[PDB]
Amino acid sequence: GAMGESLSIYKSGLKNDFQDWSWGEHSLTDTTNVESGETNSISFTPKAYGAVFLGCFECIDTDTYNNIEFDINGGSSGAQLLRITVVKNSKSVGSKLITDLNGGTPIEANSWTKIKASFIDDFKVSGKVDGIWIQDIKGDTQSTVYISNIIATA
């Protein structure tokens, strides 16, 4: 009813027709660091500017969902340097630093952090969005991160 809409993208596996277009090293079925109540996470070892990229052509209309959200675990080290990018019209149209999205704090090691980004507020993007990616920006290898509960929200 009046409860705002949500669209799951990954909840212990891909949902709602989203597609794995990732080019970095990752697994969609990591079972070593899972949130309570889930069975799998995406594991991602950020390196060589790889990224986890979840795609669904024009599936997210900002007239229905204001934000993109995910839970991230910083693994052994935390504090990974990552860029979160939104894709519209088959091109990247906006990016944000994960530390920025986390209020200026580097993501904590060994524990799960909610990451919220607003399409208009954070990416200055509106209309139909084709996907989101989480990209390594260090090149040099970073400790493995875990991603869970990817969801589009009003």
Numbering used by the authors: 552 to 705
Any passages from the paper?
Here, we present the first crystallographic structure of a CBM8 family member (CBM8), DdCBM8, from the slime mold Dictyostelium discoideum, which was identified attached to an endo-β-1,4-glucanase (glycoside hydrolase family 9). DdCBM8 is located at the C-terminal region of CelA and is connected to the catalytic GH9 domain through a threonine–glutamate–threonine–proline repeat linker. We show that the planar carbohydrate-binding site of DdCBM8, composed of aromatic residues, is similar to type A CBMs that are specific for crystalline (multichain) polysaccharides. However, affinity gel electrophoresis demonstrated that DdCBM8 also bound to soluble (single chain) polysaccharides, especially glucomannan, similar to type B CBMs, although it had no apparent affinity for oligosaccharides.
Initial phases were determined using the single-wavelength anomalous dispersion method using anomalous scattering of iodine, as described in the Experimental procedures section. At the end of refinement, the derivative dataset (resolution of 1.8 Å) displayed 13 iodine atoms with occupancies varying from 0.42 to 0.83.
